[PDB]
Structures are given as structure tokens and as C-alpha cells.
Structure prediction request, 801 residues.
Amino acid sequence: GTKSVTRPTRSSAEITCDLTVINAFYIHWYLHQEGKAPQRLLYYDVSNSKDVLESGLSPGKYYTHTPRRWSWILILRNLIENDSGVYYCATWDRGNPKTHYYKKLFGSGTTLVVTDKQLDADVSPKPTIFLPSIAETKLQKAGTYLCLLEKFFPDVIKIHWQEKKSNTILGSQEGNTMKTNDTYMKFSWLTVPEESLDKEHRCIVRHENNKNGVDQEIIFPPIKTDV
Amino acid sequence: QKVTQAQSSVSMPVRKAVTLNCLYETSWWSYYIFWYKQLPSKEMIFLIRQGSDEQNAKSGRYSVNFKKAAKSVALTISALQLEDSAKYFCALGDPGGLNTDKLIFGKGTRVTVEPRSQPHTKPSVFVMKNGTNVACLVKEFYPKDIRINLVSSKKITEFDPAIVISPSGKYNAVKLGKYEDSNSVTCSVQHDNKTVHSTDFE
Amino acid sequence: MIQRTPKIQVYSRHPAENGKSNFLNCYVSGFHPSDIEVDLLKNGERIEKVEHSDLSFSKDWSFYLLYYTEFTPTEKDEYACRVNHVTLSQPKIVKWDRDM
Amino acid sequence: RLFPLRCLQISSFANSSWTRTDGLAWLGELQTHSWSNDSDTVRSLKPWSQGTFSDQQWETLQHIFRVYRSSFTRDVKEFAKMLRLSYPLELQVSAGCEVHPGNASNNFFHVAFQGKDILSFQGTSWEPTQEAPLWVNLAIQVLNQDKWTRETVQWLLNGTCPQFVSGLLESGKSELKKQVKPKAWLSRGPSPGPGRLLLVCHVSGFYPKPVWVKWMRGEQEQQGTQPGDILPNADETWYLRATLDVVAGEAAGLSCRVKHSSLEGQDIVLYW
Ligand SMILES: CCCCCCCC/C=C\CCCCCCCCCCCCCC(=O)N[C@@H](CO[C@H]1O[C@H](CO)[C@H](O)[C@H](O)[C@H]1O)[C@H](O)[C@H](O)CCCCCCCCCCCCCC
Ligand SMILES: *[C@@H]1O[C@H](CO)[C@@H](O[C@@H]2O[C@H](CO)[C@@H](O[C@@H]3O[C@H](CO)[C@@H](O)[C@H](O)[C@@H]3O)[C@H](O)[C@H]2NC(C)=O)[C@H](O)[C@H]1NC(C)=O
Ligand SMILES: *[C@@H]1O[C@H](CO)[C@@H](O[C@@H]2O[C@H](CO)[C@@H](O)[C@H](O)[C@H]2NC(C)=O)[C@H](O)[C@H]1NC(C)=O
Ligand SMILES: *[C@@H]1O[C@H](CO)[C@@H](O[C@@H]2O[C@H](CO)[C@@H](O)[C@H](O)[C@H]2NC(C)=O)[C@H](O)[C@H]1NC(C)=O
Ligand SMILES: *[C@@H]1O[C@H](CO)[C@@H](O)[C@H](O)[C@H]1NC(C)=O
Ligand SMILES: [Cl-]
Ligand SMILES: [Mg+2]
Prediction:
């Protein structure tokens, strides 16, 4: 999944490489800006620990840090507005289908958002959960629960879900992310029939701004029958 | 070295085919072309590689129509699926055979896979709320085209419903909004020619 | 094959004239393997400032080299080139004659 | 006057540890590049040596030669160990191409071991030579299992090499189509016997190697002229010698003629 790194102008950002390359030779860094074509900015020669920058780029701006083995970090100095975009690291791999030829394999991506606003201090995704309907269980014999998250910045937010005991990715739909006074909003829903309305299930949310740093696990109780 | 993908958007129904055009410029006599697929999650997936001295490439439902003279690498997705809807990028290698090489990308083409016709099923509405925010949980309907309007006692914020695809075929929409009146809010669903009352369901 | 013995050919760039500065060219060719010792001599003493071309080889895979140095040909002084290869027991000197 | 690109390589292995790999490129008679074991790059010897390649494109090629040099030594040391081969090893590679009108081009990649042809690249794979010392077939087995290296050699020979030659011809017309006037002179030869005496003809300082040298008594050239090899000068140019034995009397009032590209029609005539 795609991460997000929010930073103010004139500061520095750390984009961590998503790939695990056992025999890395070169790590390429690409910038993909909305509406523009993805372009590589530089590549890092793993053996000689050297950054090779594209013509036009100033030295010092980008630096591939390697805090440890099989780990790469792109460091950007003096951030400006035009640095915002999705950043990928890549390698020539040969590969999941295992071919004789190398194809370029890209990481998940890190979305860099270079702010200057800093309008609200707590920019965590504020939950506004919904109670499971007793009227839907009496008719179509199914339970639906909605999770609404509002006034959080930036617009990068992921989701999943399980069933407490086993790691099962429950098939749940979402709504299109819309702009609401500088910040943003997003909601989702999960329908479960009477067949499994007795076991516990959790609504997991992934965002940059999360207490301690770990993902928020919203615990949802199962539906109850009333006469 | 330049890559152009003139098509910004393209729409085609499921089970049919689509030809994503691309024109490049290269300063290499021998090079390789690569086709990538970008998911809404920004994930970059490699589909197929071409190569100047090779025959026209084919890898599953992906096929490349390589006209070296005109410098065209039109990708074709033959038996479209709903999961095929994504942004397709055409990348020209510089040259594309060495681990130090770069890929020169096009601006991307967005394919929108149109779902097939379904039996006109009525929308199953249900009561849902919490505090100030109240929303109608609309279920399985066809056509998805609903011109839903809002007339409430204490209207604060106006939301917009989502129109996507369900594993059944008939998508379920959700339209929210925070309203001071926690008692009752009036809203009707339009199912073409008639605006079916949501009140009679629950 | 080691049987390939070098073909030493000593000459000068410009027509030899007593006093005037020139260039002494020695072309060692047709040898195999690469490992060869080549020294340009002035009365049996080798010249410290000796320069040569990059080692190359012909279609028949045998190696060839050009050794050059600036010299002042005179009636008294004698110019040679000792070439020592695995192919020969003792180094071989090929004296340069002004004529021929 | 043909201009093929010949990339020559000398890889000498004395011990299992001591190794030295050196190279050079020739665009026809002219040496275009140098590749020293000591250097991390291929030295460009002429101001037009990079051809019409950009610095980045030239860096891509620079990378192929670094990986290749490393890999070629690793692979030879491995084959020696495997195929049990005595270590004073002399490996030579000769590769390149020549481009002709009509976009036509012929490429090659030949390998020699201890000064003898063992294998070459033929179309898509490595083939042994007629006199294949058998272990070469085991080597071919291993080598042809690497579809990436085979695909890369095709790219280099069928694609990039003609591109590089075409670029070089365009870039260096100034020096390639250049002409330098030679200088001819008469010299006294040694007597092979009593009455007999050999006469020597000297010609030195011509840049385009193709030349014609012959002895003559007048308008009719004399048969018995045994010329030497076209020997090179460090001073870019070439030198040529021509011997002819006469019965002393057939030497008085002797003429000579040398045809070359540099001379504007009128041939250099040498007399007694
Ligand atoms: C063309 C002219 C344009 C530019 C002109 C510039 C002039 C430069 C001046 C002089 C150059 C002189 C050198 C001769 C030219 C040769 C060109 C290099 C050919 C490039 C393909 C090699 C790919 C490779 O490096 N291949 C390696 C690595 O492969 C691994 O790594 C790759 C990724 O890097 C892939 O993952 C791959 O799958 C994996 O196996 C091979 O190991 C091996 O070295 C083959 C080399 C071919 C030589 C084989 C010859 C056979 C000799 C064996 C017999 C030994 C006898 C035992 C004593
Ligand atoms: C309307 O929305 C609210 C706001 O989220 C709901 O209230 C929350 O729901 C949970 C579970 O039903 C309650 O339990 C508590 O949850 C927290 C975890 O966030 C946990 O720390 C506590 O130990 C406890 O189990 C709680 O009442 C409440 N929690 C929070 C943070 O607001 C609520 O379900 C809805 N209102 C009604 C009347 O149902
Ligand atoms: C091969 O043999 C040995 C080791 O296996 C080394 O020999 C030395 O070579 C250098 C010059 O390259 C000489 O200065 C030494 O006198 C040699 N030392 C000894 C102990 O023999 C070396 O690696 C290789 N030698 C050659 C000539 O290639
Ligand atoms: C020719 O090039 C190589 C470049 O690596 C030299 O390699 C030596 O052996 C290994 C790798 O094969 C290296 O780790 C060593 O550092 C190199 N030895 C030295 C003393 O630097 C090789 O030595 C070079 N050949 C000669 C004759 O100098
Ligand atoms: C080399 O180029 C020619 C062009 O006509 C082509 O026929 C041939 O297939 C190519 N060979 C390889 C090995 O790519
Ligand atoms: Cl392979
Ligand atoms: Mg292999």
C-alpha cells in the first residue's frame, strides 16, 4: 500500500523504498506528478554508494541513504511546492513470472505533500461510526455498518478489515474522496449476512497521522436480535 | 527520447477489446518498449515488453501491435474485465536492457470498463444514523443513474452518492450529510420515469 | 601457439641524415603469446625515454607493436632493438642500417 | 577504402589469481579507443570517438564493458577450474561490424584460446569452430544457457554497433577522409653476390594506407620488385620499402612511380 509523507517548505523529507532487493545493483527513483509523465530523477549505485542524477537537477537536492542492508531512503533537502508528488523506487527484476529479460519493478509509492498552511494541529482521521441496523436483519437477514472519517489531511487513507481470530480481508466498498475546507472526507460500508453475524470483526484504518504511529483498529461488535 | 499517449480517456464494454495507442521517439537503433498498468492505489504493474528486433509480442490478453517504421506500439486488451479499468502507461527504454537504464513514460491513458446490461431491479432502502449524521443505505439497483434530491428541515451539508460496481452486478450507493433534526429526514430515490418512495420499504 | 616468433623490423620516420633529429621506429610483429620484452638501444645501452603503441593483433591472432623514440643519427652512433620473448633462448638484437 | 569497427581484447591469466584484461578499437586503419585494465573506463583517443552518442548513452556502453570485463574473467577462471585447464591462459576476442550502403551491415564476435579459434557468435548463439577441442562444447552448453547474454550480444552487434559506426563516420569525416603526401627517396642496397646488387625504394609519410609502388626503366614497369610490409609510423602515417636485384648494368638511368590518394593526379617520380 501507498504511504504519505507530509512536510513544510524549506525542510527535508525521507521517502523509504518499498522494495526488498536481495541482490541490488541500482535503485532508481521516479517522480510521478498528477497529469505529468513519470520520470526518473536519479539512480543509486549500490556497489559504489553513488547517486547518479539526471541532467538539470542540482547536486545536494537528492540523496539515497542506506541506514542498513537492503534498505534505501531518498532524502530531499530544501522542499518546495513542485517537490510534491508520488515517489517510487524501482529495480530491474526478472521477476514474479521469472523471465530471461529484466523488467522494471516499482515499489508501492510514497505520496509527498509539501504544505505551508498547517491550519490544524490534530490532522488524524476522526471516526464517526454507525450503529448496525436491526431493521435490515429482520428483513433481508444481513448486517451493515458504516465508518465515516472526516477533517484529516492529507487525502491518502487506506483500509482493510478482518474477523479478529483470522486475517481475512473482508470485501467492503468505499466512497470517492471529496474536498471539504482545506481538509478531506471518506466513508465505507460492509454487508454481512445472518450466516456470520455472531463473530467479532474490526475496521482497520491506515494513515500517516495515527497516535503512537501504529494503525487505528476500530472494534465493531456483532449484531443482536431483539423482540 | 519522447513518448506520447494522445488518448486521455477510453470507454469500452466488458468482454470486448480496446487499442491503447502510443507514439515514441528514440535515439537508439535497438530499444525495448514496456507497457505498465497503474491502479487507483498508484501501484505500478508491468504487463508486456516489446523490443525492436522481435515479433509482435503477446502475453495473455495483452498484445502489442509494433509498427517500427511509424514508431507505434499500440497495446490491445482483448477480453476486457472490470478489473482492467486503470491508467495504462507506455514506457520506452533508454535502451531497456541494462540495469542502469531508465524508462521514458507517456502521460497515461485511462480505461473505463463499462459494465453490461442488468435486469432493472428496484433499490432496497434501509434506515441508518448516528448523532447528527444520517444516511440512506441504498442496495442493489439498475440503472445506476439516480437524480436524488434533498429536502430536509435542518439542511447543513450536501453530499454526493457513489456510482461504481458490485460483485452481483447492481451497485449499492450511499449519500451522507449531518442534519440537526435527529428525529426524521425526508429523501426520495429516482429509479427512471418514477421517483420510488423510500418510506414504504422500512 | 608459442611457436610464433616475433618479426623485428627497425627503420626511421624521415630519411636518415647525420645531425638532424628524427624518430627510430621498431615494429615487433607476428608473435604469440603477448608477454614480450622490447628495448631500443644506442650503442648497446638502452634509451630510458622509449614510447610504444597499444598492443594489438592481426586476423591470425598474432600480436604486433610499434616502439618509437627521438634520435639524432650520426656516423659514430649505432642504433638497435633487443627483443626478448618466451619463443627464444637468448634476447635478439636487430641493428638499424641508414641505407636499405 | 573500407571502415570496419574491430574491438580487440587481450585477456591474460597467468595464475588462478593474477589476471590482466586490455582492449582497443579500430575504425578501419585508425585506432579509435583504448581499454586499460588499470582504468575504470574506455579511453576515447580521437575528438570524434564518442560518435553521435550522448554522454549518458556513452555511459550505458561504458557500463556494459565494465560488467563484461569482470564477468569474462570470473567465467574464464570458472571454466578453467571446471574443464581442468593449465593456467597460463591467453584469451582473445575480436568483435565489431562494417556497414554498407542500403542500411546493410555484417557483424562478428570471435574468441581465440592460446592463439587458436575456439568459438564465435552466430546469429543468436555461440558455435564452436571446426577444430573444437571438445571441452569447448561443454563451454558452449553453459554459455548458450544464458539467454540474457545472447540477447545482449545481438543488441550490441545487430543494433548498437552499426549505430556506433554510422555515428563515428559522421563525426570523423575530417580525419577519416584526410590525405597526407608521402616522401620518397633513393638508397644503396647490399650486394647478395658478386655482380648482383639489390636496389631499394623508400616511401614514407602517407596517411590513407592503400598505395601502389613499382620499379620501372621507363614507361614499362620492371618485374622483380619484392616490396616489404606496409609498416606503421607513430606519426599516424605509413612507411613502405621495395627491393629489386639487378645484374649491375640494368641499374643506370633508372626511374620509379608511386600512386597515392594525396597526390593530385601527378605521381611521385624518383630517378638516379
Ligand atoms: C560493440 C562495440 C561498440 C562500442 C565500442 C567501444 C570499444 C571498446 C574497446 C574494446 C572492447 C573489447 C572487448 C570486446 C567487445 C565485447 C563486447 C561486450 C559484449 C557484451 C555482452 C556481455 C554481457 C555480459 O557481460 N555477460 C556476462 C554477465 O552475465 C550475467 O549478468 C547479467 C547482468 O549483468 C545477467 O544477469 C546474465 O544473465 C548473467 O549471466 C556473462 O557472465 C559472460 O561474461 C559472457 C561474456 C561473453 C564472453 C564469452 C566468451 C566465451 C569465453 C569462454 C571460454 C573460456 C575458456 C576457458 C579457459
Ligand atoms: C454513535 O457514534 C459514536 C462515536 O464513535 C459511538 O460511540 C462509541 O462506540 C463504542 C462501541 O460501541 C463505545 O465503546 C467504547 O469504545 C472505545 C473505542 O473507541 C473504547 O475505548 C472504550 O473502551 C469503549 O468500548 C463508546 O460508547 C463510544 N466510543 C467513542 C470513542 O466515542 C456510538 O456507537 C454511537 N452512538 C450510540 C448511542 O450508539
Ligand atoms: C603468477 O605467480 C605468482 C603467484 O601465484 C606471482 O608471482 C609474482 O609476479 C610478480 C609480477 O607480476 C613478480 O614481481 C614476483 O617476483 C612474483 N612473485 C613470486 C613469489 O613468484 C604472480 O601473481 C604471477 N606472476 C607473473 C609473472 O605473472
Ligand atoms: C586488472 O583488473 C583487476 C580489477 O579488479 C585487478 O584485480 C585484482 O584481483 C581482484 C579482483 O579480480 C581485486 O579485488 C584486487 O583488488 C585486484 N588486485 C590489485 C593488486 O589491485 C587486477 O589486479 C588487475 N590486473 C593487474 C595485472 O594488475
Ligand atoms: C539483424 O537485423 C536484420 C534486419 O533485416 C534482421 O533480419 C535480423 O533478424 C537481425 N538479427 C538478430 C539476431 O536480431
Ligand atoms: Cl538467463
Ligand atoms: Mg545464468
